[PDB]
Symmetry: D2
Subunit: 234 residues, 4 copies
């Protein structure tokens, strides 16, 4: 049996009824998903915002031994008043349908220091204790510490085009980022067992936090988004 879901937005409607907005997240009158707070054109500290697609996604099925393959593309911008003081980052993620925002700052709204099923591809702009020294793209499986990462030449206020795919038959999760402005790209892949990492139905979407001090502030804006998932026989 086959179950396929697809969606695509070239720009978000300012009152998006098929997106669950959490924390500080909102859609601007020009159709930008602004995950973290912006006040008089400036990003604010201690901000956390997430946004999930309304329909839960069937990513595996015990009854029938199927596991989903999926892919997603999106464009985002992280713009910082000071390039030397960037925090904390933006992620694409999958979590249980009732998922709520979790700790702020370096925990990216995804994880906490207290409990969590979430798989995430993170675009981390600040080196915490569990991080490598550089900014990086990471693949995260039920932990804020990445299972694998690649160093990331972040370009302030430039559009980044991301493509993420999961191939169920090989358990391979791949994440790429490209800046058309200078045609530079980064990629990372990992072997991930979605089936032991997540429940059978998840919601998908984005999460981002700005830094916990006034001077570590940046935007996390998502400009568009496509997603497709197929759950079918092995």
């Amino acid at each position: 049996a086959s179950e396929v879901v697809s969606f695509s937005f070239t720009k978000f409607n300012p009152n998006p009824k098929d997106i669950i907005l959490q924390g500080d997240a909102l859609v601007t009158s020009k159709g930008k998903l602004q995950l973290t707070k912006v006040k008089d054109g400036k990003p604010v500290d201690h901000s956390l915002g997430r946004a999930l697609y309304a329909a839960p996604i069937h990513i595996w099925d015990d009854s029938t031994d199927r596991v989903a393959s999926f892919a997603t593309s999106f464009s985002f911008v992280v713009e910082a008043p000071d390039e030397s003081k960037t925090a904390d980052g933006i992620a694409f993620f999958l979590a249980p349908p009732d998922t709520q925002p979790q700790k702020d700052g370096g925990f990216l709204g995804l994880f906490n220091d207290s409990n969590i099923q979430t798989v995430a591809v993170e675009f981390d702009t600040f080196s915490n204790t569990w991080d490598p020294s550089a900014r990086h793209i990471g693949i995260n499986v039920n932990s804020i510490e990445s299972m694998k990462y690649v160093k990331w030449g972040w370009e302030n206020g430039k559009v980044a085009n991301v493509y993420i795919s999961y191939e169920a038959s090989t358990k391979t999760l791949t994440a790429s980022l490209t800046y058309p402005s200078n045609a530079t790209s980064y990629i990372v892949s990992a072997n991930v067992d979605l089936k032991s990492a997540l429940p059978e139905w998840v919601r998908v979407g984005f999460s981002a936090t700005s830094g916990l001090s006034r001077d570590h502030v940046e935007t996390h804006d998502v400009l568009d988004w496509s997603f497709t998932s197929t759950l079918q026989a092995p």
Copy 2:
């Protein structure tokens, strides 16, 4: 700007988290959407069940003057112990996202005698006072009385393949039904202004009722379903 949503199920999972089940509706362990009650292999009277896709669908936008085109296919079966005593019918419909079940029997769970924004394509098995004498396929715009209908040679317990499309630029809503078992088909079309009939965001899905007397009973089972909607510039 463009917003596109697609989904497709070749069979429903018995605990479908992306389907809102209402009234008596359930999914059988073999993956049939059984809208109305079945007890020891027999359909029960006074049953009403509906099922909606979890994500609201953006069908028009005042801000930008877009109106969606959409299409849907599904297969259904209506099986009656007595061919001379069939009631009441099954429909595909669009309604506001918070839509709840409405009156039973000939009102098909869609409309009532008390208030309703709903557009529906109905497969009516019993001739009420607002109906033509024969069983029929109808196009319904905010009323249980159809705006147009075609006579319908219902085939007891046979699979019916339906295709419904809405072409926004011509405001044309078309509904077809085909029985592969005897290669017989029916079609009806109508001019419909989705924009004045419905709010900007709707949910879509199915509704069905069995008759209000013990002897007017039939099943309303949906076997599979695909849906696609595109909201883009004129």
Copy 3:
């Protein structure tokens, strides 16, 4: 699994992915003008066909796969005299090296002792000896005589929206025509075994002819076209 899909909202003049035959041409406004027009008028004795450049794999013996496909297109037949129409337009599948066959009533598809492999849906505007009395939408399997038909109320000069689908698992071919100006619709279906009518690979497209008398002339214009075929395990 092999899937092919293509979609044109209008045609490019000199389209390299369409094989044009006989008189067919694409106009500067992007219409596929299958039969000749000069000054402003359709001309007699014209025949034109257009096929998509890629062959389509419609069945595969080595794996017992049989394709399901769907096509949609919109066409116009304009006649200077309503009572003197000929001969019609058809969508068809034939072997990839298919060449134009008889003009006039044979629609460029067939011939009275050749054995021709071609499956077509015809929109016949002139009642030949082998035709029913009125204008008709017919399903034809390797013959100009239709295996099933439905009476067609042709609308002069008006856009017709056509949808054709073939469900492999039931061998059901369905053809529908809707005039959006009028919200008037017609449908016909037949059990057709593609496997025995046609080779494994076919070329799909259109064919039309104008009458063989100077007075029985009409245009046969295609305005858009989308096609999808899937060859998968049953």
Copy 4:
């Protein structure tokens, strides 16, 4: 708007929608074997290419449209001697009447004084005079010398998953390669103006060559392939 999409999970032997050139063939197991193997061994001096039968409309001057496209495929290069590999495999776009050009290091794509229109992503296994020192994934615009490249750690006999996309609005061509056995990935991007490198219509596909010495031999097998292109108003 013109969209074309095709997808093969394996190849049919004698595929009528693929133009095979030089030594290319499809095996009974459904592999696209671009270079010759006899007994069990890859043979020297082999060249094979395969193109999809339909030309693809990649730009249109008359409307200032430029296509965005994406392709994914998985390939294997197996060598009996790890230290003696040549020459490589490439995905490419060229004019529709494209014919095989030089063997060996020219990959069947190029030639040292012809002016050849061909855009390619190459997976080069042998360092010629114009190449960097190591095995490399290169972007090539009408020359065998790559405009940009990234070092490629080839894995002998292992399945590589490739994704290539071209974003028209930024003229960004990106190419990624992932080994799912290893979860190891590589990416390279370049600004490429398709409009000036290539004609309006192209044929897409693959080309590969084995070394010109008897000792520098390897296979070049393609296992699947999906392609989508959209030509739309900017």
